[PDB]
């Protein structure tokens with residue numbers, strides 16, 4: 075279905091480096107529709123819930139500390155295969171191993187400062203969207219380009 | 225002071241044409257700091273208050289109808305001389321008369337579909353910011369590049 | 375030989391989305407030489423001949439209907455390994471599976487609206503070129519950059 | 525009326541420098557619709573007719589010789605105020621005096637190698653269009669973005 | 675003459691903000707030829723000689739202190755009217771008053787952090803070039819594009 | 825360690841095609857720091873030493889002849905995993921096989937005119953850096969963005 079959604083968040087390093095517009099533009103050019111967007115400074119509670127799956131991993135501490143250190147731009151994009159496509163556009167966890175053309179491939183060098191977060195599955199996307207956005211903050215009627223879909 | 229702020233809104237035509245990222249990027253590259261950002265579909269009340277100054281002018285009706293027809297991306301940028309600078313970056317009311325390099329100059333052709341709104345003075349910026357944003361939605365501690373300011 | 379040629383066509387969705395220049399520019403930057411170029415609205419006969427190989431496949435009907443629905447920009451590029459290189463630059467049949475950096479990877483989401491057509495072999499390139507272009511519409515003496523070839 | 529048209533031609537220097545796509549893209553982003561497009565090597569007769577107004581001026585000889593020396597990309601764009609707008613996007617006769625953001629301002633240095641030709645009035649546009657294009661080579665039903673026009 | 679030269683220097687703020695390539699690219703696209711290029715951290719003696727004309731002005735102290743605080747990328751471009759053209763591409767002393775499309779217009783906000791230095795006349799260009807570059811560091815035989823000059 | 829360095833050289837074809845800025849910009853956007861930069865025309869001795877490893881290979885003759893035929897822009901970038909990352913950004917030896925998004929993938933077609941040279945290992949990087957640069961031409965104290973490294 076062309077109504078799948080994914081959650082993306084430009085982390086504090088991405089915001090501080092002035093890459094918000096660059097990132098949003100890549101997704102708009104692709105044809106995905108922006109259905110939610112806001113800038114906020116995450117609380118420790120939000121950070122810990124969002125990254126809950128990593129609680130027993132060694133990088134969790136710094137991960138949570140870093141995401142709550144400055145503004146984050148949260149967004150929700152809608153479109154066919156958006157979760158997997160958005161990941162391909164981001165690259166892989168390690169920016170140095172991400173291919174030129176992807177976001178981390180073009181702009182990142184350190185795994186701890188990898189610019190953006192993207193849901194890894196439809197299940198985690200649905201969970202993240204509900205965590206960061208209230209229902210009234212999301213567009214209900216989406217209208218993409220019919221030049222995009224058959 | 226380097227803490228002046230302006231209100232900018234990518235109108236429905238700008239959002240539908242996929243120019244949100246392009247626009248935000250121009251302001252980030254300039255060095256202005258994003259202190260507020262959200263996507264919403266304006267109510268008639270908000271539209272009428274925002275454009276109140278034009279109530280007796282012939283284009284008011286269509287102006288209000290158009291801005292409430294689809295999503296709008298509202299943002300607040302902070303920096304030295306941001307109100308006047310943001311206007312120069314936008315161009316002038318008529319896109320056809322806007323110079324190549326400005327937003328309306330590069331992307332617009334019709335005055336009724338001129339892509340973006342930018343406050344025209346510090347007084348109207350302060351008024352617009354309070355109309356569209358709640359205080360908690362705005363960053364209090366701004367941190368630009370010291371490579372930007374002396 | 376540096377005189378191999380390929381046939382590329384920006385489909386109606388690509389034309390309507392304003393991607394003609396973006397596409398031509400990628401090929402010019404690569405170093406391929408434009409030897410034929412024209413905009414036309416394909417007739418049913420041209421569409422059916424061009425896509426003949428797909429006549430018994432399920433998508434043929436919509437394929438032919440779509441390509442004849444609006445203007446198409448037809449072009450012929452010349453250069454060493456242009457057929458295979460042009461395909462790599464396009465991506466793969468499914469835009470969602472095309473890598474960031476390729477045309478379909480950066481701009482497409484639906485297989486039925488995948489923006490551009492590129493010959494898949496030297497044999498099909500030669501056939502397509504003769505179908506879409508008359509001999510007098512093609513440059514005979516090509517002059518690329520000697521900074522491009524040894 | 526939103527159906528005004530202008531004639532633009534990327535001269536041989538523009539074609540040789542690989543600026544065709546860059547130029548077309550600027551006009552597509554602006555919102556003008558491509559209604560005619562073809563690459564051809566101008567004959568002396570076409571060159572002399574096109575530039576007839578300059579026959580008694582000192583640069584006419586070289587002008588005609590240069591335009592017939594290599595391929596030219598001819599195009600017709602349609603939109604509100606396209607003739608005057610297309611000129612503003614081109615810059616002025618002298619590239620060195622053209623403002624950054626315009627085509628000649630960004631890419632040219634010599635008046636004799638100023639990249640592109642654009643009609644200077646609706647009257648000359650109508651004359652040039654008829655000289656370079658046959659009626660069947662021009663789109664009859666144009667369909668721009670309603671996000672562009674009110 | 676097409677052999678005029680100008681001296682340009684990307685200041686420490688421009689270098690720290692990662693704008694070296696962006697700046698060089700604008701001049702290459704214009705058609706000017708790079709005849710000298712090097713990165714160095716200016717000594718106080720070089721800074722004071724370069725900016726000698728401003729010794730009695732209030733901003734001289736900070737100017738000299740800032741230019742010696744980090745790396746600077748020095749370059750010499752050659753071409754017809756390069757001194758005046760390079761200035762137009764830079765903008766004006768105050769970045770906020772510089773037009774969108776120019777370097778300071780697109781990237782700067784503070785006069786003390788205005789990114790780049792460009793000679794203001796042929797006389798000062800010749801003086802600056804001799805101050806920053808040794809003769810053997812400059813190309814003697816320049817070869818631009820004949821697609822650039824008549 | 826975040827202080828690894830690699831040697832990159834924009835070859836004469838890259839310089840002549842006006843791709844110096846484009847190339848430097850890709851590395852600056854990635855987050856690598858420029859620690860050395862200069863334009864020079866390589867002597868036969870430098871060319872032969874640099875490419876010594878290829879002395880018994882068939883392409884050595886033309887390789888050495890070509891690199892000494894015009895200006896070359898030599899640079900040294902510093903950052904975590906810069907040697908391997910810089911190679912990924914360049915593409916592979918054959919430009920036609922290089923992926924869209926990489927330098928050779930986007931701009932090259934012939935192996936003999938493949939635009940840029942990048943060290944293939946830390947050992948060869950250290951050797952090349954010492955061959956092309958004198959110690960005083962290299963920054964000793966590097967200062968990247970802490971938004972880049974954890």
Ligand SMILES: Cc1cn([C@H]2C[C@H](O)[C@@H](COP(=O)(O)OP(=O)(O)O)O2)c(=O)[nH]c1=O
Pocket residue numbers: 133137166167185186188190191192194
């Ligand atoms: C796996 C891993 C992740 N992290 C941090 C940065 C990753 O964005 C974040 C989440 O891990 P992960 O979900 O693997 O990455 P992605 O961001 O691509 O979904 O955890 C590290 O710092 N080091 C590591 O080795």
Ligand SMILES: Cc1cn([C@H]2C[C@H](O)[C@@H](COP(=O)(O)OP(=O)(O)O)O2)c(=O)[nH]c1=O
Pocket residue numbers: 283287316317335336338340341342344
């Ligand atoms: C003056 C004018 C404005 N309008 C609409 C589009 C303008 O964005 C909007 C507000 O007018 P104005 O404040 O003049 O323009 P700007 O948007 O540059 O601040 O009113 C018209 O449709 N026609 C006109 O003649």
Ligand SMILES: Cc1cn([C@H]2C[C@H](O)[C@@H](COP(=O)(O)OP(=O)(O)O)O2)c(=O)[nH]c1=O
Pocket residue numbers: 433437466467485486488490491492494
């Ligand atoms: C294979 C396939 C193709 N098509 C359409 C879109 C493809 O451009 C067109 C031709 O098929 P194909 O030659 O496989 O693709 P390409 O365009 O990459 O050469 O047919 C579909 O709609 N669905 C499909 O599953």
Ligand SMILES: Cc1cn([C@H]2C[C@H](O)[C@@H](COP(=O)(O)OP(=O)(O)O)O2)c(=O)[nH]c1=O
Pocket residue numbers: 583587616617635636638640641642644
């Ligand atoms: C006026 C002028 C024009 N020309 C050439 C280049 C111009 O493109 C061409 C046509 O002149 P003109 O119509 O003035 O310029 P434009 O191209 O902007 O319409 O004549 C010169 O070579 N030198 C000159 O002084």
Ligand SMILES: Cc1cn([C@H]2C[C@H](O)[C@@H](COP(=O)(O)OP(=O)(O)O)O2)c(=O)[nH]c1=O
Pocket residue numbers: 733737766767785786788790791792794
């Ligand atoms: C005139 C002026 C210059 N300066 C600094 C920044 C300018 O780059 C530098 C040189 O002055 P100037 O030569 O006027 O500017 P430009 O850099 O455009 O040649 O002096 C100030 O800080 N404040 C001022 O009011």
Ligand SMILES: Cc1cn([C@H]2C[C@H](O)[C@@H](COP(=O)(O)OP(=O)(O)O)O2)c(=O)[nH]c1=O
Pocket residue numbers: 883887916917935936938940941942944
């Ligand atoms: C291997 C190879 C290299 N060369 C030339 C161009 C290569 O840049 C240069 C060095 O070879 P190599 O080190 O393989 O390539 P790279 O430049 O990617 O490090 O030798 C050829 O001309 N033909 C070939 O088959």
Ligand SMILES: [Mg+2]
Pocket residue numbers: 192193194
């Ligand atoms: Mg994950």
Ligand SMILES: [Mg+2]
Pocket residue numbers: 342343344
């Ligand atoms: Mg106003």
Ligand SMILES: [Mg+2]
Pocket residue numbers: 492493494
């Ligand atoms: Mg096929």
Ligand SMILES: [Mg+2]
Pocket residue numbers: 642643644
């Ligand atoms: Mg004229």
Ligand SMILES: [Mg+2]
Pocket residue numbers: 792793794
């Ligand atoms: Mg000065």
Ligand SMILES: [Mg+2]
Pocket residue numbers: 942943944
């Ligand atoms: Mg090698």
